[PDB]
Amino acid sequence: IEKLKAALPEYAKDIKLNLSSITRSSVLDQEQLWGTLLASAAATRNPQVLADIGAEATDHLSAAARHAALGAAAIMGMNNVFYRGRGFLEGRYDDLRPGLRMNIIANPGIPKANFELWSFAVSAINGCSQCLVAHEHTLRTVGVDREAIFEALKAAAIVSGVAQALATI
Amino acid sequence: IEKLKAALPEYAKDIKLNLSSITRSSVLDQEQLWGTLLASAAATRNPQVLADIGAEATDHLSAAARHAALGAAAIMGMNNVFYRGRGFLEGRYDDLRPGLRMNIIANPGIPKANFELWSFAVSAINGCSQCLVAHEHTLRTVGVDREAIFEALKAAAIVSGVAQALATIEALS
Amino acid sequence: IEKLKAALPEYAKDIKLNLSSITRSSVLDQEQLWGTLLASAAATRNPQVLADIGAEATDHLSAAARHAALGAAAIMGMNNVFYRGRGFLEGRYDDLRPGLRMNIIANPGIPKANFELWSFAVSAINGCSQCLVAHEHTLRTVGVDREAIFEALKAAAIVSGVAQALATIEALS
């Protein structure tokens, strides 16, 4: 949403400059861009941005896609915490069974190439490496350029910057 | 708790099933099962979520209990930053008095245990290993199990997933 | 300050003494302690805290300064995520070219040795080791004392504790 680029303060010019440029590249198609932009935004917790990018991510994302990217955010929210947490315990709990349900990572709808990538984005924002890494893997395998994956990280990072600046005014 | 479940969308079923399972569970002291779901929901920072795990906790915890829980998140919000922080600085700050009071550490009511428990929980939501390890090494001393610390982590992670799941819908309309 | 200290609960007793203690600081400046305080509040994302600190802020800080601390939080918000993610990938992308504009960092408007203190404090709140370490290195290079940097870290953690503490009350009841 352009009203979103317009809401950014003047001491956060860079973020604006980075938002209009990331939100209109090409390296990623539309479903991969807006899909990541949507996932990242719900992950910032700033509803302003989620409402805006989402409104824009309707003329690009499919009905299933929207739910997908939002599901990714939902489920990485739990996992990013779990795995990073276990990871900090020197493997001392790797034996138990997490029990956490997550049939959705099997994507329950939409291509994994995209699901997986949006999960990357979210993991980048939440700060969980044991997840950021495996998704870069699951991706790299199914394909996806090293360029596309990087741009997504750039997307997560820029969405996070917008959230912060809009949350300072 | 049961109310909050009809909230999540069709795209977050896992979270739902996940939420009814962690509480339906019985791996730890019912108390340990709420000041952890509480301190944790408080850690998430979602107002809606903190309210529900606020309702079913109304004496589901021992009054001074909530104080300990909610006090765990509050004091950890400080600690998880300072310590994670000092831990990134190559140890060039390991000898400076972090004149930060945290006396609540000598927990109020609740015996100095479940504190380190939901404390541990909170540390997970915030991502501070430095703390997460100490509260675990200590928890594994006051005779606290391990399936229970694990159970706590599952709890911490699930509420966050519930937080994220909710906050997205709570905004869009 | 005072108005914010009284809004906090009883159990958050330790944070109180902390914000109160961090407030009447000598270690850092008026501009320093306050851009940090201001940038940290913005970083905790808590509306109320940004407001109380801002209100008091625009009193010890110049417009160019208040804007700088807010720009730091905004820009670190982008950078703390990118750099952290790239480090998680183990340099396997360390030179793919970020292509992310900054410069607010090159020239923030006010003296760097203050903008850096502010970016540092925010990187501690977001938890980016790559950034904290860079900004901490930079700081020493330009003359700031580790006591001062240590003071900024504390500020950030204490402010964080405030946000967390005030957040729960604001939610429940």
Side-chain angles (χ1 to χ4, degrees):
Chain A
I1 223 70
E2 262 39 286
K3 95 192 214 73
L4 182 60
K5 304 196 301 85
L8 285 174
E10 231 64 298
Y11 51 65
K13 212 278 182 170
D14 299 322
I15 293 166
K16 189 174 294 189
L17 244 37
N18 288 161
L19 172 66
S20 45
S21 56
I22 197 70
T23 199
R24 290 211 179 66
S25 182
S26 293
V27 182
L28 297 159
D29 52 282
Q30 243 60 294
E31 181 174 359
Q32 293 196 304
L33 225 192
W34 300 102
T36 292
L37 300 159
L38 181 50
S40 293
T44 60
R45 302 326 195 304
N46 182 295
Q48 222 278 71
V49 178
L50 206 227
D52 287 327
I53 290 183
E56 250 295 52
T58 91
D59 185 291
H60 304 292
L61 268 58
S62 154
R66 297 177 44 63
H67 300 298
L70 300 178
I75 196 65
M76 285 306 98
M78 169 179 74
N79 296 344
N80 287 345
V81 165
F82 182 68
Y83 301 121
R84 173 180 67 204
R86 202 178 49 164
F88 292 148
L89 302 176
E90 298 173 298
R92 292 161 62 158
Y93 292 70
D94 296 343
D95 57 305
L96 289 321
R97 257 203 164 195
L100 317 183
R101 231 100 295 194
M102 50 211 281
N103 314 314
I104 188 177
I105 302 297
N107 217 337
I110 222 56
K112 281 196 170 184
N114 290 177
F115 184 69
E116 281 308 295
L117 182 65
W118 305 331
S119 297
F120 179 70
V122 173
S123 308
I125 287 166
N126 290 312
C128 176
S129 61
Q130 0 285 57
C131 278
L132 187 69
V133 165
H135 286 157
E136 189 289 293
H137 180 78
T138 299
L139 274 156
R140 218 66 195 63
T141 281
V142 179
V144 179
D145 330 56
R146 181 165 169 267
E147 277 264 352
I149 293 177
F150 185 62
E151 199 77 356
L153 169 56
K154 293 174 57 185
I158 299 169
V159 177
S160 301
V162 178
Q164 175 68 79
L166 244 44
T168 188
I169 71 176
Chain B
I1 295 301
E2 47 202 67
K3 297 292 175 54
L4 210 179
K5 302 188 297 166
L8 311 158
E10 303 129 282
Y11 66 59
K13 186 179 286 167
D14 294 310
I15 297 71
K16 191 255 264 65
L17 294 171
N18 261 151
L19 186 47
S20 35
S21 291
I22 211 291
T23 9
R24 160 62 192 176
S25 180
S26 75
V27 174
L28 26 65
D29 276 295
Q30 198 69 326
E31 170 182 284
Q32 303 194 309
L33 194 263
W34 294 86
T36 285
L37 246 70
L38 187 75
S40 109
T44 70
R45 243 141 292 210
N46 175 302
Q48 182 184 201
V49 185
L50 178 52
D52 308 38
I53 292 62
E56 291 188 58
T58 48
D59 281 7
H60 211 315
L61 292 175
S62 53
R66 321 188 67 171
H67 216 63
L70 292 168
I75 195 66
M76 228 57 243
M78 185 193 71
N79 272 199
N80 297 358
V81 173
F82 175 78
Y83 288 117
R84 173 173 58 188
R86 184 180 57 176
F88 290 156
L89 301 170
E90 297 138 23
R92 286 93 142 299
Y93 300 74
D94 300 10
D95 71 297
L96 290 169
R97 15 60 175 172
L100 296 178
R101 279 228 211 165
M102 49 187 86
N103 309 185
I104 187 189
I105 201 66
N107 215 51
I110 263 303
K112 188 173 62 292
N114 297 189
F115 183 53
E116 307 299 62
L117 189 76
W118 22 64
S119 206
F120 166 84
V122 170
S123 299
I125 305 287
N126 291 332
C128 183
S129 50
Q130 205 83 188
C131 287
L132 189 69
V133 64
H135 285 168
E136 103 73 16
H137 181 57
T138 180
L139 216 50
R140 284 238 265 180
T141 295
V142 292
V144 161
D145 194 0
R146 172 165 142 286
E147 330 289 308
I149 301 185
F150 187 71
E151 189 71 353
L153 178 66
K154 312 220 300 169
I158 296 163
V159 179
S160 296
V162 164
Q164 169 67 217
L166 249 51
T168 162
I169 67 171
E170 304 175 63
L172 302 189
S173 189
Chain C
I1 60 177
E2 297 281 352
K3 356 65 64 57
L4 176 58
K5 267 130 61 178
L8 299 162
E10 246 298 71
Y11 55 72
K13 175 258 183 182
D14 284 294
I15 313 308
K16 300 188 79 300
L17 312 176
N18 306 152
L19 185 52
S20 158
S21 187
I22 215 302
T23 285
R24 48 104 60 191
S25 158
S26 92
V27 189
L28 293 177
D29 254 336
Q30 194 187 313
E31 187 189 343
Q32 278 168 162
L33 213 205
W34 267 281
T36 301
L37 286 188
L38 178 65
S40 289
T44 71
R45 247 49 91 82
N46 183 103
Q48 278 63 55
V49 183
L50 199 191
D52 299 351
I53 289 54
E56 182 76 62
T58 48
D59 203 293
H60 314 274
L61 303 169
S62 72
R66 164 190 167 170
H67 284 166
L70 296 181
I75 195 77
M76 284 306 84
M78 163 177 71
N79 285 346
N80 298 150
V81 178
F82 175 79
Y83 295 110
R84 192 178 66 191
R86 221 179 52 172
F88 280 172
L89 292 181
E90 309 177 69
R92 292 190 301 161
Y93 285 74
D94 257 49
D95 220 296
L96 188 54
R97 183 168 73 193
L100 298 181
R101 277 58 66 70
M102 284 156 236
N103 174 52
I104 187 181
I105 303 154
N107 170 60
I110 38 72
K112 301 166 190 167
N114 288 172
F115 184 78
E116 288 291 320
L117 191 70
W118 302 331
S119 292
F120 169 89
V122 171
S123 300
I125 289 187
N126 293 128
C128 176
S129 170
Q130 266 81 54
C131 287
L132 194 66
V133 173
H135 297 299
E136 188 286 320
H137 260 312
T138 297
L139 250 14
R140 293 192 281 78
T141 294
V142 286
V144 187
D145 275 306
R146 61 167 195 142
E147 355 301 338
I149 310 174
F150 185 65
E151 197 69 15
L153 179 56
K154 300 181 49 170
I158 302 174
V159 160
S160 297
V162 178
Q164 165 73 280
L166 229 301
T168 92
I169 343 158
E170 273 166 37
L172 56 77
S173 63

Coordinates of all heavy atoms in Angstrom, one line a residue, chain C residues 1-9 15-24 34 37 48-49 51-57 60 162 166 169:
Chain C
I1 N 8.8 9.5 33.4 CA 9.6 8.9 34.5 C 8.7 8.6 35.7 O 8.2 7.5 35.8 CB 10.7 9.9 35.0 CG1 10.1 11.2 35.4 CG2 11.7 10.1 33.8 CD1 11.2 12.2 35.9
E2 N 8.5 9.5 36.6 CA 7.7 9.4 37.8 C 6.3 8.8 37.5 O 5.9 7.9 38.1 CB 7.5 10.8 38.5 CG 8.8 11.4 39.0 CD 9.3 10.8 40.3 OE1 8.5 10.0 40.9 OE2 10.4 11.2 40.7
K3 N 5.7 9.4 36.4 CA 4.4 8.9 36.0 C 4.4 7.5 35.5 O 3.4 6.8 35.5 CB 3.9 9.9 34.9 CG 4.8 11.1 34.6 CD 6.1 10.6 34.0 CE 6.0 10.0 32.6 NZ 5.3 10.9 31.7
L4 N 5.6 7.1 34.9 CA 5.7 5.8 34.4 C 6.1 4.8 35.5 O 5.7 3.6 35.4 CB 6.9 5.8 33.3 CG 7.2 4.4 32.7 CD1 6.0 3.8 32.0 CD2 8.4 4.6 31.7
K5 N 6.8 5.2 36.5 CA 7.2 4.4 37.6 C 6.1 4.0 38.5 O 6.1 2.9 39.1 CB 8.3 5.2 38.4 CG 9.7 4.9 38.1 CD 10.5 6.1 37.9 CE 10.6 7.0 39.1 NZ 11.5 8.2 38.9
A6 N 5.0 4.9 38.5 CA 3.9 4.6 39.3 C 2.8 3.7 38.6 O 1.9 3.2 39.2 CB 3.2 5.9 39.8
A7 N 3.0 3.6 37.3 CA 2.1 2.9 36.4 C 2.5 1.4 36.5 O 1.6 0.5 36.2 CB 2.2 3.3 35.0
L8 N 3.7 1.1 36.9 CA 4.3 -0.2 37.0 C 3.7 -0.9 38.3 O 3.5 -0.3 39.3 CB 5.8 -0.1 37.2 CG 6.6 0.4 36.0 CD1 8.0 0.8 36.5 CD2 6.7 -0.6 34.9
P9 N 3.5 -2.2 38.2 CA 3.0 -3.0 39.4 C 4.0 -3.1 40.5 O 5.1 -2.6 40.5 CB 2.7 -4.4 38.7 CG 2.3 -4.0 37.3 CD 3.4 -3.0 37.0
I15 N 12.3 -3.5 38.5 CA 12.4 -2.6 37.4 C 12.3 -1.1 37.8 O 13.1 -0.3 37.3 CB 11.3 -2.9 36.3 CG1 11.2 -4.4 36.1 CG2 11.7 -2.1 35.0 CD1 12.5 -5.1 35.7
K16 N 11.4 -0.9 38.7 CA 11.2 0.4 39.2 C 12.5 1.0 39.7 O 12.9 2.0 39.2 CB 10.2 0.3 40.4 CG 8.8 -0.2 40.1 CD 7.8 -0.1 41.2 CE 7.2 1.3 41.3 NZ 8.3 2.3 41.6
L17 N 13.2 0.4 40.6 CA 14.4 0.9 41.1 C 15.4 1.0 40.0 O 16.3 1.9 40.1 CB 15.0 -0.1 42.2 CG 14.1 -0.6 43.3 CD1 14.8 -1.6 44.2 CD2 13.6 0.6 44.1
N18 N 15.3 0.2 39.0 CA 16.2 0.2 37.8 C 16.0 1.5 36.9 O 16.9 2.2 36.6 CB 16.0 -1.1 37.0 CG 16.2 -2.3 37.9 OD1 15.6 -3.4 37.6 ND2 17.0 -2.2 38.9
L19 N 14.7 1.7 36.5 CA 14.5 2.9 35.7 C 14.8 4.1 36.5 O 15.3 5.1 35.9 CB 13.0 3.0 35.2 CG 12.8 4.1 34.2 CD1 13.8 4.0 33.1 CD2 11.4 4.1 33.6
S20 N 14.5 4.1 37.8 CA 14.7 5.2 38.7 C 16.2 5.4 38.8 O 16.7 6.6 38.9 CB 14.1 4.9 40.0 OG 14.7 5.6 41.1
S21 N 16.9 4.3 38.9 CA 18.4 4.4 39.0 C 19.0 4.8 37.7 O 19.9 5.7 37.7 CB 18.9 3.0 39.4 OG 20.3 3.0 39.7
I22 N 18.6 4.2 36.6 CA 19.2 4.6 35.3 C 18.9 6.0 35.0 O 19.7 6.7 34.4 CB 18.6 3.6 34.2 CG1 19.7 3.4 33.1 CG2 17.4 4.3 33.5 CD1 20.2 4.6 32.5
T23 N 17.7 6.5 35.4 CA 17.3 7.8 35.1 C 18.4 8.8 35.7 O 19.1 9.5 34.9 CB 15.9 8.2 35.7 OG1 14.9 7.6 34.9 CG2 15.7 9.7 35.7
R24 N 18.5 8.9 37.0 CA 19.5 9.8 37.6 C 21.0 9.3 37.4 O 21.7 9.2 38.4 CB 19.2 10.0 39.1 CG 18.9 8.8 39.9 CD 20.1 8.5 40.8 NE 20.4 9.6 41.7 CZ 21.5 9.6 42.4 NH1 22.4 8.6 42.3 NH2 21.7 10.6 43.2
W34 N 19.6 10.0 27.1 CA 18.3 10.3 26.6 C 18.0 9.8 25.2 O 16.8 9.5 24.9 CB 17.9 11.7 26.8 CG 17.2 11.9 28.1 CD1 15.9 11.6 28.3 CD2 17.7 12.1 29.4 NE1 15.6 11.6 29.6 CE2 16.7 12.0 30.3 CE3 19.0 12.5 29.8 CZ2 16.9 12.1 31.7 CZ3 19.2 12.7 31.2 CH2 18.2 12.5 32.1
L37 N 17.7 6.1 26.0 CA 16.4 5.9 26.6 C 15.3 6.0 25.5 O 14.5 5.1 25.5 CB 16.2 6.9 27.7 CG 17.0 6.8 29.1 CD1 16.5 7.8 30.1 CD2 16.8 5.4 29.6
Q48 N 3.0 3.3 25.1 CA 3.0 4.1 26.4 C 4.4 4.5 26.8 O 4.7 5.6 27.1 CB 2.4 3.3 27.5 CG 0.8 3.4 27.5 CD 0.1 2.8 26.3 OE1 0.3 1.7 25.9 NE2 -0.7 3.6 25.7
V49 N 5.4 3.5 26.7 CA 6.8 3.8 27.1 C 7.4 4.8 26.1 O 8.2 5.6 26.6 CB 7.6 2.5 27.2 CG1 9.0 2.9 27.7 CG2 7.0 1.5 28.1
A51 N 6.0 7.1 24.6 CA 5.4 8.3 25.0 C 5.9 9.0 26.2 O 6.2 10.2 26.2 CB 3.8 8.1 25.1
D52 N 6.0 8.2 27.3 CA 6.5 8.8 28.6 C 7.9 9.3 28.4 O 8.3 10.4 28.8 CB 6.4 7.8 29.8 CG 5.0 7.4 30.0 OD1 4.0 7.9 29.5 OD2 4.8 6.5 30.9
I53 N 8.7 8.4 27.8 CA 10.1 8.7 27.6 C 10.3 9.8 26.6 O 11.1 10.7 26.7 CB 11.0 7.5 27.1 CG1 11.1 6.5 28.3 CG2 12.4 7.9 26.7 CD1 9.8 6.1 28.9
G54 N 9.5 9.8 25.5 CA 9.5 10.9 24.5 C 9.2 12.2 25.1 O 9.9 13.2 25.0
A55 N 8.1 12.2 25.9 CA 7.6 13.4 26.5 C 8.7 14.0 27.4 O 9.0 15.2 27.3 CB 6.4 13.1 27.4
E56 N 9.4 13.2 28.1 CA 10.5 13.7 28.9 C 11.7 14.0 28.0 O 12.5 14.9 28.2 CB 10.9 12.7 30.0 CG 12.0 13.1 30.9 CD 11.6 14.1 32.0 OE1 10.7 13.7 32.8 OE2 12.1 15.2 32.0
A57 N 11.8 13.1 27.0 CA 12.9 13.2 26.0 C 13.1 14.6 25.4 O 14.1 15.3 25.7 CB 12.8 12.2 24.9
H60 N 15.6 17.3 27.0 CA 17.0 17.1 27.2 C 17.7 16.8 25.9 O 18.9 16.8 25.8 CB 17.3 15.9 28.1 CG 16.4 15.8 29.3 ND1 16.7 16.4 30.5 CD2 15.3 15.1 29.5 CE1 15.8 16.1 31.4 NE2 14.9 15.3 30.8
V162 N 10.9 -2.4 31.5 CA 9.7 -1.5 31.7 C 8.6 -1.8 30.7 O 7.5 -2.1 31.1 CB 10.2 0.0 31.4 CG1 9.0 0.9 31.5 CG2 11.3 0.4 32.3
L166 N 5.0 -2.8 32.0 CA 3.9 -2.0 31.7 C 2.9 -2.7 30.8 O 1.7 -2.5 30.9 CB 4.3 -0.7 31.1 CG 3.7 0.5 31.9 CD1 2.1 0.5 31.8 CD2 4.1 0.6 33.3
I169 N 0.2 -5.1 32.6 CA -0.9 -4.4 33.3 C -1.8 -3.9 32.2 O -3.0 -4.2 32.3 CB -0.4 -3.1 34.1 CG1 1.1 -3.2 34.2 CG2 -1.1 -3.1 35.4 CD1 1.7 -1.8 34.5

